[PDB]
Design a protein around this ligand. Structure first.
Ligand SMILES: Cc1cccc(CNC[C@@H](O)[C@H](Cc2ccccc2)NC(=O)C2=Cc3ccccc3Oc3ccccc32)c1
Length: 374
């Protein structure tokens, strides 16, 4: 497990792992996505990629005989399903056989500036298309590499990250690691209890946060909250610093705000906290991100030091704990013990200052019981 620094990328276009495919090997850059379950790579040249996997040049590729199509929150692709040997340079140097989708048609999938050309779904089989029978990349890796049915991830950006496949790397986190039970095994679903802002809880039927699901998803850039909650939050974040002028367009994500001074506008925003039920019902723990993680900066340009985008987006049906939140912790996907753990991530510092916090346990016995509506 010296898979440390095995990921390149950032909150902007995602984190990617480098893997070698076929025989001889073809070098590809895969986007790590805990929010889905298919392995797919560019099967033809395309607008924003400079390489793709050519099945005709791999003597170890076998065609499975059918096409498959996946549609994510936004974007989709269609490709031929097949098999081939894969080698993950840093980590496992003994190739294994995995299913593989070769994209021959995509729409809003590859965006400008991405450095990857394939996506690795680390979710459950249920989510796999065409069906729960097209064994997951990880499912294979587990059997063939005979490793523990576990994997943890750490994103650094504010450098790359680490996708430790099959265990937990203790050098990546200081402090205790809290675990929350995985409610449904499809997306990595967990139950959120409260949502604090500047210490002020939102005071909303906790079922609100869990309707109809709250998932941990590296494959999603922002922290997406279902509408009603998004509003509550925005209103909150605003009230706690009505002084600055960030137009409603900023909140929508339509625009970016640019600062002309050397001083960052962080000291003016509140902290945001999410409470998750601990494995011990009666208690809960809470993860927290400071504004450096949700008032994300972009290249300066012009007479501006930099411009910032809002790291929070409104959702229709789902609470997605994406990159903006994971960027602050070391997430452990303990599929074996049906639980997800979080730990304060060291690399998540800015000027020697912690940008995320985690603490517990707090009493749950007072509010809730089960916040996941049936
Ligand atoms: C099977 C399925 C169907 C619906 C929902 C899910 C839940 N997770 C979504 C990720 O798998 C997907 C990964 C991905 C990565 C690169 C290109 C396409 C897809 N990202 C997203 O759909 C996604 C969602 C949203 C939605 C609103 C705001 C930010 C944001 O995050 C980003 C950011 C960049 C690219 C896709 C993406 C899964």
């Amino acid at each position: 497990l010296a898979m440390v620094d095995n990921l390149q990328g950032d909150s902007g276009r995602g984190y990617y792992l480098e893997m070698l495919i076929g025989t001889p090997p073809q070098k590809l850059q895969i986007l790590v996505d805990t929010g889905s379950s298919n392995f797919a790579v560019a099967g033809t040249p395309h607008s924003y990629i400079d390489t793709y996997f050519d099945t005709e040049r791999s003597s170890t590729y076998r065609s499975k005989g059918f096409d498959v199509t996946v549609k994510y929150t936004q974007g989709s692709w269609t490709g031929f399903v097949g098999e081939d040997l894969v080698t993950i340079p840093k980590g496992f140097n003994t190739s294994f056989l995995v299913n593989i989708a070769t994209i021959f048609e995509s729409e809003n999938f590859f965006l400008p500036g991405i450095k990857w050309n394939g996506i690795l779904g680390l979710a459950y089989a249920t989510l796999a298309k065409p069906s729960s029978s097209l064994e997951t990349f990880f499912d294979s890796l587990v059997t063939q590499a005979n490793i523990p049915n576990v994997f943890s991830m750490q994103m650094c950006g504010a450098n790359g990250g680490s996708l430790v496949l099959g265990g937990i790397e203790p050098s990546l986190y200081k402090g205790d690691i809290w675990y929350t039970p995985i409610k449904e095994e499809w997306y990595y679903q967990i139950e959120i209890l409260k949502l604090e802002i500047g210490g002020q809880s939102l005071n909303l039927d906790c079922r609100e946060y869990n309707a109809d699901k709250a998932i941990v998803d590296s494959g999603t850039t922002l922290l997406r909250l279902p509408q009603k909650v998004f509003d509550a939050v925005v209103e909150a974040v605003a009230r706690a610093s009505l002084i600055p002028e960030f137009s409603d367009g900023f909140w929508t994500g339509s625009q970016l705000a640019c600062w002309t001074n050397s001083e960052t506008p962080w000291s003016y925003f509140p902290k945001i906290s999410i409470y998750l039920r601990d494995e011990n019902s009666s208690r809960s723990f809470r993860i927290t991100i400071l504004p450096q993680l949700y008032i994300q900066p972009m290249m300066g340009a012009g007479l501006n030091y930099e411009c910032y985008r809002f790291g929070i987006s409104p959702s229709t049906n789902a609470l997605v704990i994406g990159a903006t939140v994971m960027e602050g912790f070391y997430v452990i996907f303990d599929r074996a013990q049906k639980r997800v753990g979080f730990a304060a991530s060291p690399c998540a510092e800015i000027a020697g200052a912690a940008v995320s916090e985690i603490s517990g346990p707090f009493s749950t016995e007072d509010v809730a019981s089960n916040c996941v509506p049936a």
